[PDB]
Each structure stands twice: as structure tokens, then as C-alpha cells.
TrEMBL record:
A family per Pfam: GramPos_pilinD1
Species whose genome carries this gene: Ligilactobacillus ruminis ATCC 25644
Keywords per UniProt: Cell wall, Membrane, Peptidoglycan-anchor, Secreted, Signal, Transmembrane, Transmembrane helix
Protein name in the entry: LPXTG-motif cell wall anchor domain protein
PROSITE patterns: GRAM_POS_ANCHORING (PS50847)
């Protein structure tokens, strides 16, 4: 019987009509949050109401899909959405908690109101409550589109990126809108792969820049239907390594949106990585002795058979196929050292596959290995290892003659 009226005010300062808010019942959810905050203490803290509000608000995504809806109101008459006659208590005398979220229309921050609300005097209960929900200012974003816990790629492999940039309300008053991609050393952006959501290719210009990034240039008038919106740009990139100290280091992509002269906050993607492996050719009977003249190919093995051969390198990128010719191959000097770098982690490989080096030329007077030597690439497996401490590979000395 005893109820309150709750009015939300929506701003952007200027009031906005036509924005929907939905009220969900979170009585039970708030109560449990409140208990957690009060713990084993003799008196629920002052902090507790605030703390439990926050916690329930942060579960808004989930709670909209499950919690009872008690009202829907669209803002009108200068951004007003009144939810009239909201119960202070349920039918068991417990106080109600209400989640308010913008569901249709700078989105309003969701927030929770737990009854009762007291006036500034501290003793009287409010029946007409007036809230001003602050708005989540959308800002720029760059995303790596890679549904995995590990962001590891072979050199040459395509990496999908998304760029979401804010387009102002007063876009039509402006001259030019600009999106500059600045990839960190090691990443090459493929400008010819650029697409933009809801915007014909004939409405913008793309320049390839000398840091392997690019600048998109859009005349402001072409972005009129995008006023107040996010502009989504998809683009591909790849890793190309000319400095080996980049192996096993995080390689972010970056981007800045610009309107006329005013830059947005630069944004950054998840880092990508590429790995490698170092090897040392030794005498099986005497492993301090390192051997020159050995040639190893990089291959993939499954079920003990060589299934594929690597082509190319860490700069130009690798491909793998069943062509036994023009294979990525290294030759050992007197220190016995070789390496293959710019490879994704062993876990990223197909089922049953493993990297391997297949010996195709033995050092003079040493037996040619008949099987490929398996190896394992992981995070840090290349750069945390001196050349001399590479994976030892043992060769058997050919013996002398006696009649």
C-alpha cells in the first residue's frame, strides 16, 4: 500500500526524449550483496548500501535476462521517465531494491535503488525520488579478433582487428574525420583489407604510411548518418620480423581518431606474440664439441611422418604445404648453432602435429639422422635462451676403417 515514485532525468547539457528505461526487481539480489558487505559485524556499515548497489549494478548484463520487470518508461517532456507507485516493501515486509537500465533510445550507467530512501534530514522517507543517472561516455577502441587465451601467430599469418571510433553529433559542421593506425614495430597492417560498416569504399581515401600503418580520410559530410554513433572499421595485419629481439615480445596495434584538429585518446589492442627455437649440433659422445656443415629443414610431423614443409622466413613470412622443394633450411657454423624464429606456439598447431627439424645434410664424418628431431615452441622459448644453450642435437661419429 505504501509506495514511492521514482523519476529519472536523462541528459547528454541537454535533456533527451525517446530514451527507454526498464525497471527490474532485484530485492533478493541486493539483500545478498548487503549481507556480504555486513559480514560477521554487529551492525551493517554505512558503506554497505553503496557497496551492494555497486555490486548489483555490475551484474546488470546478466540480471536483465533473468530479473522480473516492474516497469518500462520512455523519457518525455524534457527527458523525464517516472516510475509511479513503486512498492517500498514486498508482501513479507522486506524492503525492495530496483535496477534501472536504459534499454532503447552516451548510454546511462545502470544503477540500483534500494528502499527506503531517506531525506537530507535523515529521518523522513521520500515518496518522490529524483535520480540523475550519469552516462557512460563511449570512447575509441581497438580490438584483436582472436578467440583464444594465447595471441600467438606465425610470421605472415593474418590477424583480424576491429576499430570502433566515436562520431560526434555535430559531425556535419566539421571538415574531415581521420583514423591513423600506428602498429608497433613488427606488425604490418594490410590497408587493402580495410572495410567500414555502412559506408561505401567510394566515400573515403586510404593512404599507406611509412610505419606500416595507414591513414583513412573521410570528408565530414559523408559521416552525417553516423552522428552520435560508433564507426566500425575492420582490417587485417601480419607479423614481419626484421629485428629478432622482437621475438617473444608483445606487439600491440594502435590507432588515433581525429576530427579536424582535435585528436581522440589513442587506443591500443591486445598484444600479439611470435615465438622461436634455438638448436645446437653436437657430437653425441662428446657434447662440448659443436659441428659445422649440418643442414636442417623446418617441417611439421604427425604420427612420426613429415606431413608438411615450411617455406619462407620470419621477415617474408612462412607457408606450409606438401612441396618438398625450396624448404626453409639452415646451415650450422663451427659453433653448431641454428634457429627458426617467427613461429606460433606448439599448442596452436593442428591436432597431433609437432614442429621438427629434419636433417638433410650431415656434418662430414657424421651419420645422417634418419628421423626428424621434434621440438616445442612456447612463450619465451626463444629469447630467454642464449644461442649456445639451444636444444642439443646429437650426431654419431662415423668410425674408422680396419680390414
Amino acid at each position: 500500500t505504501e509506495t514511492a515514485t521514482v523519476t529519472l532525468h536523462k541528459y547528454v547539457a541537454e535533456a533527451l526524449d525517446g530514451v527507454e528505461f526498464t525497471a527490474y526487481d532485484v530485492t533478493s539480489e541486493y539483500a545478498d550483496a548487503y549481507k556480504t558487505a555486513t559480514g560477521d559485524k554487529n551492525e551493517s556499515p554505512a558503506d554497505a548500501a553503496k557497496t551492494a548497489s555497486a555490486a548489483v549494478a555490475k551484474k546488470a548484463d546478466a540480471l536483465q535476462k533473468t530479473a522480473t520487470v516492474v516497469g518500462k518508461q520512455t523519457t518525455a517532456n524534457g527527458g523525464l521517465a517516472s516510475f509511479a507507485n513503486l512498492p517500498l516493501r514486498d508482501a513479507n515486509g522486506n524492503y525492495k531494491a530496483y535496477l534501472f537500465a536504459e534499454t532503447d533510445a552516451q548510454k546511462a550507467e545502470p544503477f540500483v535503488l534500494a528502499m527506503p530512501i531517506y531525506g537530507a534530514d535523515g529521518k523522513t522517507v521520500q515518496k518522490s525520488i529524483n535520480i540523475y543517472p550519469k552516462n557512460v561516455k563511449q570512447s575509441d577502441k581497438k580490438t584483436l579478433n582472436d578467440n583464444r587465451s594465447h595471441h600467438d601467430f606465425t610470421a605472415g599469418e593474418k590477424i583480424n582487428y576491429s576499430i570502433e571510433t566515436v562520431v560526434p553529433w555535430n559531425i556535419a559542421n566539421k571538415k574531415v574525420y581521420t583514423i591513423t593506425d600506428n602498429p608497433s614495430k613488427g606488425l604490418i597492417m594490410d590497408a587493402d583489407t580495410i572495410q567500414i560498416e555502412g559506408l561505401a569504399s567510394n566515400k573515403y581515401t586510404v593512404k599507406k604510411n611509412a610505419d606500416n600503418g595507414f591513414t583513412i580520410t573521410i570528408p565530414a559530410a559523408n559521416l552525417a548518418a553516423f552522428a552520435g554513433k560508433t564507426l566500425k572499421t575492420t582490417v587485417k595485419g601480419h607479423l614481419s620480423i626484421e629485428d629478432l629481439t622482437l621475438i617473444d615480445t608483445g606487439i600491440p596495434n594502435k590507432a588515433t581518431a581525429k576530427v579536424d584538429n582535435e585528436a581522440h585518446h589513442e587506443v591500443k589492442s591486445e598484444e600479439v606474440f611470435t615465438g622461436g627455437k634455438k638448436f645446437v649440433k653436437v657430437d653425441g659422445s662428446n657434447q662440448s664439441k659443436t659441428l659445422a656443415g649440418a643442414q636442417f629443414q623446418l617441417v611439421i610431423v604427425k604420427n612420426g611422418q613429415v606431413v608438411k614443409y615450411a617455406h619462407g622466413n620470419e621477415k617474408d613470412g612462412y607457408t606450409f604445404d606438401t612441396n618438398n622443394t625450396n624448404v626453409a633450411t639452415k646451415t650450422t657454423g663451427e659453433n653448431g648453432q641454428f634457429e627458426f624464429a617467427g613461429l606460433k606456439y606448439s599448442e596452436s598447431l593442428e591436432a597431433g602435429e609437432s614442429y621438427a627439424v629434419k636433417e638433410v645434410k650431415a656434418p662430414t664424418g657424421y651419420d645422417l639422422l634418419k628421423d626428424p628431431v621434434l621440438f616445442t615452441v612456447t612463450k619465451d622459448s626463444y629469447k630467454t635462451v642464449q644461442a649456445a644453450d639451444g636444444q642439443k642435437i646429437s650426431n654419431t661419429k662415423k668410425g674408422g676403417f680396419l680390414p
